[PDB]
Symmetry: C5
Subunit: 393 residues, 5 copies
């Protein structure tokens, strides 16, 4: 209308977007900063990037953008575009986007008292440290650090307000615990001036039902199968084939959980340590079974030829467990061959007792590894039952 | 021509793109908003993003862009570029594009009555919740929420019109059910002002012929093969090899359907639950067959050594199913060895009866799992026959 | 020079880029539109996008950009940048690029008669329907639809000229058949005005030598191997192992041709149907061979226990194909055991006749499937020999 | 300083960036164009794109940007940004970047004589034809075609200078042979005017050490293994298992070299042809061995039942290579069974002679294929020894 | 305030962003350049790109942007945006980003003495040479080369300051050793003018715990298994199956370490050389075992038929290691068949002695290869223990 046109013509007279809008130049300009989280779009562990949907919230007071409502009846607010009035230069310090600023520039809304509001939307990709040493039951804290790039403490007085989560859309993979904020003043090598800073710490907790069904069940089944092959009597066909099958299959296909983790050499997930330990154990079992099967089975003393190992093995055993007549004489000779088969079965009994001792060693080593893994994963996080109480449902 | 030049010079005199074009500043400006869907370009389930081709439709009235046709004969419309006249700031709230606005800025067409039309094209990537718990027979509702970013209810009066689907190009994968819209007023933490909003709900239904041919046929064949190996008599070579082959092959290669689903731990697709249940069953079958095959086969009472299991197994069985003379005496001894072979075959008969009881257990557990899966997938969605009536064709 | 400077100063006096350059405002402005194809850079079937290198060609007449050559001797043409003169807003309607306009904005060349030429280059990604139901011998027609976004029939009079292919660089994968164009007037829901439109239909034909060598040879070899295993006598070791190997290997690795096709459930490629049919046949063969091998081989009447199947099988067969004395009596008993082995071999002969009947069923079903596949692929497209005449070379 | 400010104010007086800077408008403006290659960043064969790091070099003379050094003491050069003075519109015709111009716009440096230099940097992705039919010993020529888009021969007189390679950083994969340039005038369908053009042909030669160690050694080992299995006597266990293992493993895993080549059906790499030929040969060997092993082994005349094949096989062979008494009579009968075993071994000898004839056929066919492959790859390129002289080192 | 507005109006009077801000035009303008590293975001070996997060630091003096604080009380600094004052054109020469400049343009802060500071943030992708010939224990030096594009030594006097690492965030994969800088003057083919340059050399050291646990343990286990199969007696079932399993599995799956390395044919990682050598050795072992197993086992002189090999093998051996009566005569004949079995076992003993000689050859060749590999990897880098002292922890 007429009054809106007159007001817009008046307001921009002698205005300088460069100048900071304060009545007194010696005093700071208070700016209230806050955040509104709408969606956690991605939590990428390979590159360690958290991608979120966020509305910023900046509020301040402009001294020159004031008018009297009775003189311009009907108009109570005006809106200014990006390059027409002064705006704070608030940036995310720890950004991972190719462009350092990922906010869509919308209008600034001003009312009759010169109160400016600015709520730009954006999709922010920030770099945060991802820890999967406790996978799949882990809590992640990712920081978002916002601050003015070129305005010090004596010029721009940043203030913090509590973040808004009323419009949050729950994620199917991660459960939001909270998002608290902290305001602090930092000193840099640039210059002698404190710089305010506002940091929001998004805390997420994973939902373990999908990964549970995908990994825990076949992992438990494979561990039980390995326990069986440890308990299985040593034989050529079934034992060696099953051992090599478990070894190769696990060693090749277990990387489907390693492909979701970074290569950071700060710690190891407990599931990977358990896999590696059982892998070494089953490898030792298969090599020792092959040795006791094919290397030598014709004499009971073959394995115990050194006294040094013999003493320890014995201690462990004590601690744990006419012409027609000569043709019929050739029939007696094949009977003696059956007797030699009995001798070979006695040698096999001795070597199988040794192999069962080694198998019991593999067995209780594997069970101790499983026990430490499960006691670590059960009493790991405070109020762990919550997961089984909430996620498994 | 001369009149077009004169009109263009006249119209921009004293014009202010910032000012809202109304005769009375105290009354809202009515804007009619609508949509035109041309193509569903992608429905990505990994990142849960719907990518579509859309023409927006905004219509309003500009008070200052009016002229008399008799004074400028021949010219009936004018066109203005992006930054020369006032345009509504209509944005998609739930956007997933790196830039928050994905519309190509075209001209605004105005006629002699000051009626402005604006039809920008665009390719919109919006985030919507994808549910595959009913895969491959699922219906997806994805929302598109459009609204003015900085104009309240008292300034911009948004109105809704029915979406246009006359130019829709059918998709080969998804069948469009409808696209209805709803206009609602929301309250935010920004300020005391209602904000109008227009939401269009694109509803799609999957076409199951491709996935049917790709998955259902080999899945049915593999399930039948598993039924066979459950019904197959317990033996060393064929039974164990087939069981381990099914286990490993299914466990490794069934992820081709998991790679098309998100990791959201809100529910589980029924096909995955059926696969996991049959997987546990076949694993139990192979371990029990190995136990009854190699652990002990020299005595019928080997398996039934505890009374606690013996009573239950018995109840289940009742409920269901000179020197030459001594050489010829050694020939009698190998005949007695054949008799011991008969004794071993009797032990094998007992152990195979036990293994067949376990196999019947595996069999009817697997059939109950298949029955619940198929009864879930058959009577799942209302008017399910439509699929077989329309898609399979 | 001096005259160029004077002319450039003169020409832009009172010029309005917004105004349409016509002497009479009541008459349309004729614009000639054409295309120049240089390279088909990609034909992506997963997302169904054709990526090409194209020079547009727009020609029109500007009424105000005229001068007298005798007054400005030496200068015959001038060039204007993007935002300094009026240009048609010609867009590709069915675009798939994230930005809806993918043309590089070059200069506009004007000569002394006010004839404007505009030849912007670009790399255009357009969405076209890809049909692989006839793979690998398929012809694809992909459309490019260009038109003015905001200028109707009464304002901009679009005209079509034949496309230029003199600079085309042949592609190694696709053979260009032609690129004809058609101009048509459309009616939209926007408004009461016809809108001209120019559509160019790029027609491509695939080159089958690479895919031929990669797929046809091993596919033929595997089909011959399957024919062998169908013709092979039923036995424990070779038959079952070969059948399961073919089944698993084909079922897992045949997806290398499915990964190049979309998931559109409109039709099925004939190669996939043939693979699925032979897959079902070989699965039935392996299950029936396992049944006749291990389920029962001790009685000839085991398989024919129901009369319903017995009658049909018989009809098919008719239509197609002292103490020392007692020890030597135990030797007679093992001779009788050899006689029982002969009885078992007779049972095996009967069961193998049945299995060979089933194998002949599998065989001629597989050959009928191969016959329909090859008769479909041979007489599919008109002038098919061209391929073997031109591509295989 | 004062003189720099005065000079900058003077120089832009009455300046027109649109106008071509010549004293006489009837004469062309000579522009010297050259290139400086710094790094070959990528040579992608899948999409056939060469990505390089290049500094362009344009030099010309501006008539209006001249001054007297004695009047402005101390200032000898000035610099102008992108849109403030006239610059040639030099573009890469065969570009593959989404944006058609991939140069960073830097300043233009002018000295007291009005000599303008322009050296913009850039990363250029150009489309060139990649030929791998001679892989891994191939030489690639990729073209870069630069020219003025809208300035003809009578307006802009392009000239060529030799490219600069003093700052080249050697690549680990490709060895640069040269980069010669050629200037030529072209005629287009646009209009009646010649258009100058400058084309630089980057010539690269691959380094074969990495691919040598990765592929040649295991390929040679696998070929030797196939030669062994061809020379191995026909038997059930080892022969068939080894043949099927080689077939399946090679057929599945040899695509690691096909994944680095385009699908262009213009020619075939010799390594792929050799693989396919040996693949057919070994497939024929395994099928014929299975036939001679299990189809029939009870009669020597089984294989030679038709005279047509019998004559050729014979020609090839000629050209190449009381009650106790009756029980002991049953013992004589099992001795006769051993005699029938001898008869079966004679049949096996005949069938194995036939199978060894077929194996010799497979053997020398495979060796001829290897011989043609190695004679093609040895005497393929002129001065081939250079590779082994330079790359293998 | 009033004074800020007056100062901003005053400062831009007669200002020229093009002009270099010096009081004397004949003297260079000193610019201090420095860097601040915050995070090493990626070190990509496939494309050889280092992606880092960096704040640049430029400081200089502007002659015209000076004022008296007593005249403008309260204002001590002003800030200017990108295009309003003169800024150095400092670029990264060896950039790999699609756009050659990857810095976010922030404000320039000026104080009362005309001292300009400029600290733009950015994410820089620079191309550096990645060497993995010492993987996984390698030190990488990647260069960042910054300089003025169009300002020579006589105009812009670049100076270097030590980089800042006080805000560095440690990486989980790479350990930062240092980042020293060097300033040097270069001569180009452009022109006769030295050009200053500042180069920072980021030095990183890998952390080997993750890769250690992932690769070293299974590699050691597989090498031990290969040692076993070399030491295992030659037999049909276990020996050949294990050898072929190791060969195929290693040859197929060892590429998981090759996928993290470039294809540069400058050197070979020692792990790959060791794998290839053991691969050749085990291939020779399996082929020779198959030859000695199935080719000929009926005569001890079969293998030693040429004197040339016989002499060397012997030298190596010396250097290292009524009617009833005739039926019972047929029983004597099967006893003689057992004697022929003993003869065959003697032939097997001779051939197995030969095979064990070949196995010892394979064994100590493999151990020498392992010894050279481990002695290379142990005493490779100075102060190697640091890794095991710091990384393994
Ligand atoms: C606003 O306008 C009305 C009428 O002119 C006047 O009474 C009132 O005092 C004005 N308000 C201020 C703060 O001047
Ligand atoms: C438009 O022009 C004609 C002639 O000048 C006049 O008769 C008519 O009244 C005008 N229309 C309006 C609304 O003034
Ligand atoms: C162009 O200039 C010449 C000389 O001034 C004149 O003779 C000629 O008539 C002019 N052409 C036109 C169309 O006026
Ligand atoms: C440049 O300036 C000096 C002194 O004013 C004068 O002598 C000289 O002639 C001038 N050069 C030209 C080309 O005019
Ligand atoms: C700055 O202003 C004060 C008061 O006007 C004056 O005394 C002082 O000399 C001024 N400083 C300079 C360098 O002129
Ligand atoms: C309702 N709008 C859309 C989201 C924020 C809100 C708003 C309010 C005022 C200024 N900008 C944005």
């Amino acid at each position: 209308g007429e009054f809106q046109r007159k007001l817009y013509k008046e307001l921009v007279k002698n205005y300088n977007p460069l100048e900071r809008p304060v009545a007194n130049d010696s005093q700071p300009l208070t700016v209230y900063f806050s955040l509104s989280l709408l969606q956690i779009m991605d939590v990428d562990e390979k590159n360690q990037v958290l991608t979120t949907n966020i509305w910023l919230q900046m509020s301040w007071t402009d001294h020159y953008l004031q008018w009297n409502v009775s003189e311009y009846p009907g108009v109570k607010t005006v809106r200014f575009p990006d390059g027409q009035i002064w705006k704070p230069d608030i940036l995310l310090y720890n950004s991972a986007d190719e462009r350092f600023d990922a906010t869509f520039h919308t209008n600034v809304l001003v009312n009759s008292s010169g109160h400016c509001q600015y709520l730009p939307p954006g999709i922010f990709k920030s770099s945060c440290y991802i820890d999967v040493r406790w996978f799949p039951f882990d809590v992640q804290h990712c920081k978002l650090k916002f601050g003015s790039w070129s305005y010090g403490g004596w010029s721009l007085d940043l203030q913090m307000q509590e973040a808004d989560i009323s419009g949050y859309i729950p994620n199917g993979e991660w459960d939001l615990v909270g998002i608290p904020g902290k305001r602090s003043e930092r000193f840099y090598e640039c210059c002698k001036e404190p710089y305010p800073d506002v940091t929001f710490t998004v805390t997420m907790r994973r939902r373990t039902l999908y990964y549970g069904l995908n990994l825990l069940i076949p992992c438990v089944l494979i561990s039980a199968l390995a326990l069986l092959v440890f308990l299985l009597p040593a034989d050529s066909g079934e034992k060696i084939s099953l051992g090599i099958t478990v070894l190769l299959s696990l060693t090749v296909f277990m990387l489907l959980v390693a492909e979701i983790m970074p290569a950071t050499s700060d710690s190891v997930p407990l599931i990977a340590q358990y896999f590696a330990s059982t892998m070494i154990i089953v490898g030792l079992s298969v090599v020792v079974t092959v040795i006791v099967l094919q290397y030598h089975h014709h004499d009971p003393d073959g394995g115990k030829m050194p006294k040094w190992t013999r003493v320890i093995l014995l201690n462990w055993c004590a601690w744990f467990l006419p012409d027609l007549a000569k043709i019929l004489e050739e029939v007696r000779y094949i009977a003696n061959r059956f007797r030699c088969q009995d001798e070979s079965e006695a040698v096999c009994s001795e070597w199988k007792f040794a192999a069962c001792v080694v198998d019991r060693l593999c067995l209780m080593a594997f069970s101790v590894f499983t026990i430490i893994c499960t006691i670590g994963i059960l009493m790991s996080a405070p109020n762990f039952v919550e997961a089984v109480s909430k996620d498994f449902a």
